[PDB]
C-alpha cells in the first residue's frame, strides 16, 4: 500500500509581488545568527569560523566541500540566509524619503493623520475607485500631501505641529518648540522654566535655549511608527499587505548567501564591508559597558548610520572629509546599475 | 566566460535582441537567451511566495506547496540580490495552461 | 494597533464563536462599509454576515447609519469592542453597592445586550425563583425598587428610541429606522401593567413595547476614579480625609462635567453638614483639616476663594496625572529596582540636567550609573535635548540635556499592557487545546461518575472510574486549574492600571 | 586575521625590519627573521629579560 | 474678461454653483474660431446609443479608448462634460476619410 | 573637595557600605520619629510639626551613635537625607533659622519627614511579560512564543 | 499616435516613459533604477508579467 | 563566538499575586459565566453539515433549533432572520 503522490505540476509565474519584511519575519526566514567579526581560524588550515561571516552553513564558494545546511556542493547549492542585529535602530537610506514624508504627514503627538472627515470621505472614495494606476496613486499622494501640509493644528488631539527639517544628511529634526516668528505662545514659560537647573549649573545654556528643536532621532521615530492607527495606514498609500510602516526602520539585516559573494583572489567587497558592521556593533556593546559620556556613545551610534548607507550604495555626498571613504566601493546599487 | 583568451564565446548584445524581436521570432529569442546560455532550475513555495531548496520550504516548514520552475540563472541571482536589500519579490504561481 | 486587534479578535471569538469575529475584525480594521462589499472582502455569504451583524448591533459593538445617496453602512465601535473585559468590575461594584438582585440584573443586561423593563424584570425574577424553594417567591416591587435606585443614580439607563416613523416620511420608508436618543425621559421607568411575582417555567400583552434599557458604564468609571482618589488620600493622611473627600465628591456628582479638570467649589459650611453623623469633627477642626489638604503640595484640592465659607476645588486633571506618574514610578521601581526610580525622579524634578550634574545627587559612582542611564533609552522613557552651541551642529559643541515626557511614556506602556494580557490569554487557550484529550477524558469519566451517582447507585463503579492513568493525571489537571486561576487573577489584576492610564490620556484631549 | 600582539612585542618586530633594511638584503630575509623572532618570543626568561637583551636578540 | 481674473475669482469659478456652469474666456481667444483653422479637423458630439453601438462593434470598455483632456481648446469650445465620446474625422490625402473616436476625461 | 572628596572618598575607592548604612539608619530614625509623633494621635495640625525631624537633631543623634569613626558633617548628613526624598521616602519643609544650634539656611532652617508609598505594587508588575527582557522578540509565530516561553512555565510553580 | 493617444503630448524621455508604462521591471531596466525599485516596494505593486 | 541562548536569566522575579475573597469570588464567576454564555443563541457554532447517509436515529435524537427573535423595528430593511 502507498499514498498517491502528485509528482510534478507545470507552473507559470503570474505576478511578481514586491514588499518589505519585518524583523520578526526576518528572523524567521534566516538560518543562523552570525556573531563574530573574524572569518578564518587562527590556525594554519585557513578554515572558516563556525559563527562568523563566511560560515559554510550558509553556502559554498569553492569546489572541495559541501554546504552543511543541504549537504550538496557548489554545483547545486541554492544558498541560505543568515542575520545580524543592530544595538540601535537605523534609517534605511533607501526609504529615507518615505520616512520623512510619513513624519510630515502624521501628528507628532497622537499618531492620527490631520484630516477632516470630509477629506477622509473624498479620499477613501478615490481609493475605492476601480483601476488605480501608479500615476494615479502618485496623484493622490500629491493631493493628500498638498491638503495636509497647509494645515497646522490637529483636529483629533487639539495640539499643533511644526515642520520637519533636515539637520545634516541622514538625520532629521522638527521645528516644534523653537522661538516663533508669530511670537511665542505662553508655553514658552514652561520651556524657560525647564532649563532652570541647567542654567544654574551651566549659564551658557541660556543664550542657546531659544534655538531648541524636537529631537526625533531614529529610535524615537521607530517607537512612533509602532502606533499609527490601522485605519490610517492605507491613506499613507502603503499597501497594508506589503508591509507595516515599522519596517522602514531596521533593527536586523540579512547577510546574503555566499553564492552572491564568492571569495578567491581572497577578498570580496561585501564580505568585508559587512565585517565592519559587525565590528562596530561589538564596539558599541563593549562601549555600552564603559562609563563613557553621551558624546562618543552617539558618535559610535551614527557611525553605523554611515556604514549601512555605504553598504547599500557608495555615492553619498554629505560626508565630512575626516571620515569620508578612502576608496571606491561596490554596494548593492553599484552592482545593479550600469552597462 | 568573456573572451578568447579564456574561450568565452560571443555576446548577443541588446542590439540584436531588438533585431530578433522585429522579425517576430519568439522561440528563437527564448532559445538563444535562455536554453543555451544559462537555463537553471529552482524550487518555489507556492504558499508564501519565497524560494526554497530540495523540495523543502524552510520558511513555512512544509514540503507540499513547493514547485520546480525553469528560470535564467541571472534572474535567480537577481531575487537573492534584492531580498537582502530589504526589497522582496514574492512569486505568485498558477497553472501553465 | 496590532495588539488591540489581537485582543478583540480572540475576545469576540470567545464570546460569539469563530464564525463571526472575522467580520468584526474586518470592520474594526476598516471602519464602515455596506454589506454588499464586506460580503466580498470576507468572502462569506449574505446570510452569515446578516446573522453576525444582527448580534453585533444587539450588543452595539457595531452601529449603523444612513449616508449619502441613501446607502446604509455599519460603523465599528473601536473602543466598546475592547471594553468587554471590564464586566467583572461592574458585577463586583453592583454587588458591593447593592443586593444580589441588582447583580443578577446587570448580568442579564450585558448578556442579552438590551432588554425592555417587562422583559428584564420577568426574566430576572424567573431565574431567582430557582434560588429558593418551599413556595417562597419575590415580587416585582423589590426588583423595581432596585432598578429605580439604579436609574436615579444613573447606573442603568434607557436605550435610544425610534423617531415617529409611523407618522413621518410617508411613502417608501427609509432603509433604516435611524433611532434617536434624548435625556428628558432617559432615566424614567415606564409603568408596567404586569403585576405579581416571578413564575417558574415549563421550558418549552406587553405595555412597554420597545422600551429597552442598558447599564451606564461610564457611571461606573466615574465611581472608580472617585474610589482611587479617596483610597490615595486615606493612605496618605487618614481615613477622615477620605470621608470628607467622599463628601464633596458626592455633592459634586452632577455639578460638573464628567471629564472636566475641576469642580465648582463647595463651602466647608456645606461639608460640615453633608458629612455623616458618625464623625465627631467640629467645624473649626474641619476647616483646619481642609486647610491642610489644600496645603498639601500634591495639590489634589485647591482653595480658589473664601466666599460663603471655605471654598475648595478638587483638581481632577492633576489627580489623574499624580496617579499615572505614581504608576510610572512604580513599574520602573519593580522592573529595574529603586536606584532607577532615584535617577528617574532626579530628571523628573530636574527637568533638564546632565549626567555630570546628577552623579553627586545619585551618589552612585561612574562606570555603572552612566550605563544605567543609557539602558533606559531602550524603553523610550528618557529623552535628550541636545541643544547645539554652534550652527555647525557638531556633536563636540552641543549640550546633552536629558528630558522626560510623561504622555509619550504612558502611551507606550499601554501596548505592553495589552500584549501582556494577550500573551496570558492565548497561553491559556494553548494549554487548553493541547490538553483537550485530558479534558475530554476527565469530562467523560466525571459524567460517568455523575451517572448513577445517588439514584440507582451501586458500589461497582465508585472506585473503578479513577483507577486508571487518570490517578496521577488528575493532579495535572488540578495544577492546570491552578495555572488557569493564576493567569485569570492576572487578568483582573492588570487593568486597574489600564483604567487610570487611559483616563489620564483621554482627559488630556482638548478636542479643538 | 592579524592578532593585536603585545605592544612591546611589535615594537621589537619593528626593530627587526628596521635592521634588515640597513643592509637592504632581499626581502625573504626580513620575513624569515620575523618568524625566528616570534619563535624566540615564547619563553618566560626572554619575556622578563631586560630590553637591552632584547635589542641584542633581534640582532642574532 | 479683459485682462484676467483675481485668484479668489479664479477659485470660485470651479465651485460657485454646481447647478450652474460658467465657462470662462478672454477676448483674446475669440478673435478667431478655431474650427476655421487648418490644423484641426471636424468634431461631432456622439450620443449614448451610438456609444453602445461602437463599443459593441469592437467589444471594448470605455477605459480602452484614446483620450482628450477637458481643458483642451475644442473641448472648451463645445463645453463637453467629461465622460463622453467625440467623433474625429481626420482628412486624408484621398476621398477616404479617417474616422476615429476619442474619450474626454 | 574635587581632590579630597570628603569622608565618602577613601583610598581611590568609595565606601559604599558607609553611605548605605547612613541612608538606612537615617530613614530608620525618620520613620521612628514620624510614627512616635503620630502615636500622639491628638490633632493633625500638631502632627504637621511633630512628624518632621530637624536636620541638626538627626545629625546630633547619628553622630551620637558614632557608627563611622570619620566625622559626620552637618551638610553631609543633610545631603544624605537628600537622597531619601529622591528615594521617594521622605518629605521636606523649611522653617525659621532659630531651630537647632546651626540654622543651616540664611534666616531659615529645613526639616525632613518619612513618607508612605502612595500605591501598592501594581498588577502589571505581577505579570511575567512585564519583567520579560525579550518582550520585543516574543511572538506567537516566533520561535520564542507564549506557547514556548520558559519564564511563564516556571512562573506557574511558585 | 503613440506620442498623443494618452490625451497629452508625451516625450520619449525617462520622465515621459514613466507616464506610459505601468510595470516595474521594464522601467528599472532603462533609467532611474534604484528610485523606481524602492518606491515600487513602498506602494506594494503587483506586476503582471506581460 | 558562541551566540547567547534563547532565554537569559533575570535578576528580579515578578511580584506574586494578591489574594482576596470577593476577588476570588469574581474569578469563580469568571470561569462559570464564560462557559454559560456560549449557550445563548447569539453564539453560533458551525451549522449541521456532512452527514453520510440517512439512518433513522437522527429522527429520535434529532437536534432542536429555531430562528432567533431580534427586534424587527430597530435594524435595516434587510434584517429578516
Ligand atoms: S516569553 Fe512569555 S513572559 Fe516573555 S513576553 Fe513572551 S509570553 Fe511574555
Ligand atoms: Zn546549501
Ligand atoms: Zn494630534
Ligand atoms: Zn513557503
PDB file of N, CA and C and ligand atoms in Angstrom, chain B residues 45-50 57-62 65-66, ligand 4:
ATOM      1  N   UNK B  45       8.131  28.016  -3.173  1.00  0.00           N
ATOM      2  CA  UNK B  45       6.993  27.655  -2.340  1.00  0.00           C
ATOM      3  C   UNK B  45       5.779  28.457  -2.788  1.00  0.00           C
ATOM      4  N   UNK B  46       4.702  27.766  -3.158  1.00  0.00           N
ATOM      5  CA  UNK B  46       3.510  28.453  -3.619  1.00  0.00           C
ATOM      6  C   UNK B  46       2.756  29.194  -2.537  1.00  0.00           C
ATOM      7  N   UNK B  47       2.860  28.751  -1.287  1.00  0.00           N
ATOM      8  CA  UNK B  47       2.053  29.338  -0.222  1.00  0.00           C
ATOM      9  C   UNK B  47       2.580  30.704   0.191  1.00  0.00           C
ATOM     10  N   UNK B  48       3.883  30.810   0.449  1.00  0.00           N
ATOM     11  CA  UNK B  48       4.454  32.065   0.927  1.00  0.00           C
ATOM     12  C   UNK B  48       5.033  32.917  -0.186  1.00  0.00           C
ATOM     13  N   UNK B  49       5.399  32.324  -1.315  1.00  0.00           N
ATOM     14  CA  UNK B  49       5.936  33.079  -2.423  1.00  0.00           C
ATOM     15  C   UNK B  49       7.429  33.300  -2.401  1.00  0.00           C
ATOM     16  N   UNK B  50       8.161  32.614  -1.538  1.00  0.00           N
ATOM     17  CA  UNK B  50       9.611  32.703  -1.491  1.00  0.00           C
ATOM     18  C   UNK B  50      10.235  31.462  -2.123  1.00  0.00           C
ATOM     19  N   UNK B  57      10.509  23.996   2.063  1.00  0.00           N
ATOM     20  CA  UNK B  57      10.380  25.429   2.316  1.00  0.00           C
ATOM     21  C   UNK B  57      10.650  25.703   3.786  1.00  0.00           C
ATOM     22  N   UNK B  58      11.906  25.990   4.088  1.00  0.00           N
ATOM     23  CA  UNK B  58      12.312  26.249   5.458  1.00  0.00           C
ATOM     24  C   UNK B  58      11.478  27.331   6.112  1.00  0.00           C
ATOM     25  N   UNK B  59      10.933  28.252   5.330  1.00  0.00           N
ATOM     26  CA  UNK B  59      10.116  29.312   5.910  1.00  0.00           C
ATOM     27  C   UNK B  59       8.821  28.771   6.502  1.00  0.00           C
ATOM     28  N   UNK B  60       8.068  27.992   5.731  1.00  0.00           N
ATOM     29  CA  UNK B  60       6.768  27.508   6.181  1.00  0.00           C
ATOM     30  C   UNK B  60       6.834  26.167   6.887  1.00  0.00           C
ATOM     31  N   UNK B  61       7.962  25.469   6.825  1.00  0.00           N
ATOM     32  CA  UNK B  61       8.079  24.124   7.376  1.00  0.00           C
ATOM     33  C   UNK B  61       7.091  23.170   6.707  1.00  0.00           C
ATOM     34  N   UNK B  62       7.241  23.002   5.395  1.00  0.00           N
ATOM     35  CA  UNK B  62       6.429  22.017   4.691  1.00  0.00           C
ATOM     36  C   UNK B  62       7.046  21.673   3.349  1.00  0.00           C
ATOM     37  N   UNK B  65       3.734  22.433  -0.706  1.00  0.00           N
ATOM     38  CA  UNK B  65       3.459  23.564  -1.577  1.00  0.00           C
ATOM     39  C   UNK B  65       4.573  23.894  -2.563  1.00  0.00           C
ATOM     40  N   UNK B  66       5.738  23.249  -2.469  1.00  0.00           N
ATOM     41  CA  UNK B  66       6.877  23.630  -3.299  1.00  0.00           C
ATOM     42  C   UNK B  66       6.713  23.142  -4.733  1.00  0.00           C
TER      43      UNK B  66
HETATM   44 ZN1  LIG I   4       6.840  28.770   1.968  1.00  0.00          ZN
END
